[PDB]
């Protein structure tokens, strides 16, 4: 049909307990329509869940299918992401389901939890129709058990644990994705304009992290690059998917004969226009290498990509580094020869 | 080494290479299998040509947690229904705490596994180290205990109260 649904009120929110792996973790969750205004969403995230406004936002994208990473890359990815999200008060936006890069984020949070204090506000925006049990969560404002074990024959993906909060959006359909991209982008756009506690006049800085990916990841990274406030992105090379393709294409800034990948409809169908536009806006892309180039730590690679991406003056960079409470970043990337602070 | 090129065992060697799905070669400083004990044990899981529950049972009997953690519990194993529950019960009987922790981490939950029948079965095991529970049950009942007596949870309640 042409989305002929019923605008019934919500019937699934509260707290869920994850029976399963060796952890006692709670996770607030709601269920709203995919046509919801970001203002009430931020009101709910600030008042109902009692979350302070972040000083940094990291939107994590990737491919919605399971993959594998080399053991050396996982150590320099999970630890760096956790350090960057923990030293700086920040929010992590993820898919929410237990597929692909989100599983890597989940195990990165699992490894950190066994050796350090603190909680990381990981927010998952997942479609409602893909959870393993759409039932067992209908109890409103009551603790609901949830089982981490999933059978591959069920054609549905279980909700990933080790997530602080969940936002579930349903368009009226089940078994198909694409019910959360618009709401997630709208919320991120609105929260970018939200004013930080510093009265200079700057919003929170938003960054994009790309691991693995697909054909649509080039489209979303173009959407990030073309936005009226330019949002810097950070890509990884060792994944092997289009993130590796974009990292390879970062070299030789404007070899079109290398278009054969057995990945699209031959040489007839290409995303090369989108890739060329992304390379046209090359000044924002940042590529992480495992020691091949500078910035061997992704915790610094994320933070150092927001100072230059802000396109602001030295006082604004100093204010951001002061709010993040990262003295090393300001000492190494800000206080350098010839900065010309005003009076 | 043999009678020139006239006499050879190349037919036998070719048949062995035809059956090469079982041969395992240990090389020092190679890509994998850096130790003999790992090379020996990992050659029995695939050589059994059995299901994942059988591999888990073998790794549980051997009391090698690392082998099951690295060579068994991998992505996409397709555990049948009611298999991990039986594995948890067998690990609980044999006093294999590491395998209990690994199974708990890998999906199973005690709120669904533990029933009345399974607990009463756990109270009537003969594996593991020795204990003095039977003497306690005899003393609570003041003797007169027939041979081959099943221990019920009411007896456990009485001995706890005593």
Curated annotation (Swiss-Prot), chain B:
Domain of life assignment: Eukaryota
Subcellular localization(s) per the UniProt record: Cell membrane
Disruption phenotype: Trpm3-deficient mice exhibit clear deficits in their avoidance to noxious heat. Trpm3-deficient mice display reduced hypersensitivity to thermal, but not to mechanical, stimuli in carrageen-induced inflammatory pain. In the chronic constriction injury (CCI) model of neuropathic pain, intraperitoneal injection of isosakuranetin or primidone do not reduced heat sensitivity in Trpm3-deficient mice.
Endpoints of the signal sequence: none
Role summary: Constitutively active, non-selective divalent cation-conducting channel that is permeable to Ca(2+), Mn(2+), and Mg(2+), with a high permeability for Ca(2+). However, can be enhanced by increasing temperature and by ligands, including the endogenous neurosteroid pregnenolone sulfate and sphingosine-1 and suppressed by intracellular Mg(2+). Implicated in a variety of cellular processes, including insulin/peptide secretion, vascular constriction and dilation, noxious heat sensing, inflammatory and spontaneous pain sensitivity.
Quaternary structure, from the entry: Homotetramer. Interacts with TRPM1; the interaction results in the formation of a heteromultimeric cation channel complex that are functionally different from the homomeric channels.
Similarity remark: Belongs to the transient receptor (TC 1.A.4) family. LTrpC subfamily. TRPM3 sub-subfamily.
Protein name, as recorded: Transient receptor potential cation channel subfamily M member 3
Gene: Trpm3
């Amino acid at each position: 049909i042409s989305k002929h649904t019923q605008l019934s009120p919500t019937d699934a929110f509260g707290t869920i307990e994850f029976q399963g792996g060796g952890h006692s973790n709670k996770a607030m969750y709601v269920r709203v329509s995919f046509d919801t205004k970001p203002d009430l969403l931020l009101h709910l995230m600030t008042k109902e869940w009692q979350l302070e406004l972040p000083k940094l936002l990291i939107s994590v994208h990737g491919g919605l299918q399971n993959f594998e990473l080399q053991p050396k890359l996982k150590q320099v990815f999970g630890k760096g992401l956790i350090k960057a999200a923990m030293t700086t008060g920040a929010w992590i936006f993820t898919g929410g389901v237990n597929t692909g890069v989100i599983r890597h984020v989940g195990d990165a949070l699992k490894d950190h939890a066994s050796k350090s204090r603190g909680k990381i506000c990981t927010i998952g925006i997942a479609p409602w129709g893909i959870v393993e049990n759409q039932e067992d969560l209908i109890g409103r404002d009551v603790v609901r058990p949830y089982q981490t074990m999933s059978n591959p024959m069920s054609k549905l993906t279980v909700l990933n644990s080790m997530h602080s909060h969940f936002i579930l959006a349903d368009n009226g359909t089940t078994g198909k994705y694409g019910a959360e991209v618009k709401l997630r982008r709208q919320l991120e756009k609105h929260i970018s304009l939200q004013k930080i506690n510093t009265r200079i006049g700057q919003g929170v800085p938003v960054v994009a992290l790309i691991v693995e990916g697909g054909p649509n990841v080039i489209s979303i990274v173009l959407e990030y690059l073309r936005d009226t406030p330019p949002v810097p992105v950070v890509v990884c090379d060792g994944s092997g998917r289009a993130s590796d393709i974009l990292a390879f294409g970062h070299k030789y800034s404007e070899v079109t004969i290398q278009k054969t990948f057995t990945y699209t409809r031959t040489q007839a169908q290409h995303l090369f226009i989108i890739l060329m536009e992304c390379m046209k806006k090359k000044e924002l892309i940042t590529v992480f290498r495992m020691g091949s180039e500078g910035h061997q730590d992704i915790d610094l690679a994320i933070l150092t990509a927001l100072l230059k991406g802000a396109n602001a003056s030295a006082p604004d960079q100093l204010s951001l580094a002061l709010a993040w409470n990262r003295v090393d970043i300001a000492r190494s990337q800000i206080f350098i020869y010839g900065q010309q602070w005003p009076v | 080494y043999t009678r020139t090129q006239a006499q050879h065992l190349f037919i036998i060697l070719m048949e062995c290479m035809k059956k090469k799905e079982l041969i395992t070669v240990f090389r020092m400083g190679s890509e994998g299998h850096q130790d003999i004990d790992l090379a020996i044990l990992t050659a029995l899981l695939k050589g059994a040509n059995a299901s994942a529950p059988d591999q888990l049972s073998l790794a549980l009997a051997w009391n090698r947690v690392d082998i099951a953690r690295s060579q068994i519990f991998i992505y996409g194993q397709q555990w049948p229904v009611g298999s991990l529950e039986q594995a948890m019960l067998d690990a609980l009987v044999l006093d294999r705490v590491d395998f209990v922790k690994l199974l708990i981490e890998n999906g199973v939950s005690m709120h669904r596994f533990l029933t009345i029948s399974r607990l009463e079965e756990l109270y009537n095991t003969r594996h593991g180290p020795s204990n003095t529970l039977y003497h306690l049950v005899r003393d609570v009942k003041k003797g007169n205990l027939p041979p081959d007596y099943r221990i019920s949870l009411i007896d456990i309640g009485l001995v706890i109260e005593y």
